[PDB]
Amino acid sequence: LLGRSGNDRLILSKN
C-alpha cells in the first residue's frame, strides 16, 4: 500500500 505498484496491503508494490 501507499503508492501505485505491484500489490501490497492495499495499493503499492512493496518497496
* CB 7, CB 1: distance < 8 Å: no
* CB 2, CB 13: distance < 8 Å: no
Contacts of 15 (CB under 8 A, 6+ apart): none
DSSP state letter for 2: -
DSSP state letter for 12: S
- Does the CA dihedral 9-12-13-15 come out positive or negative? negative
* CB 15, CB 7: distance < 8 Å: no
Give the number of residues written for the chain.
15
Torsion region of 8: left, alpha or beta (phi above 0 gives left; psi -120 to 50 gives alpha): beta
Cα separation, 12 vs 1, in Å, equals: 4
C-alpha cell at 15: 518497496
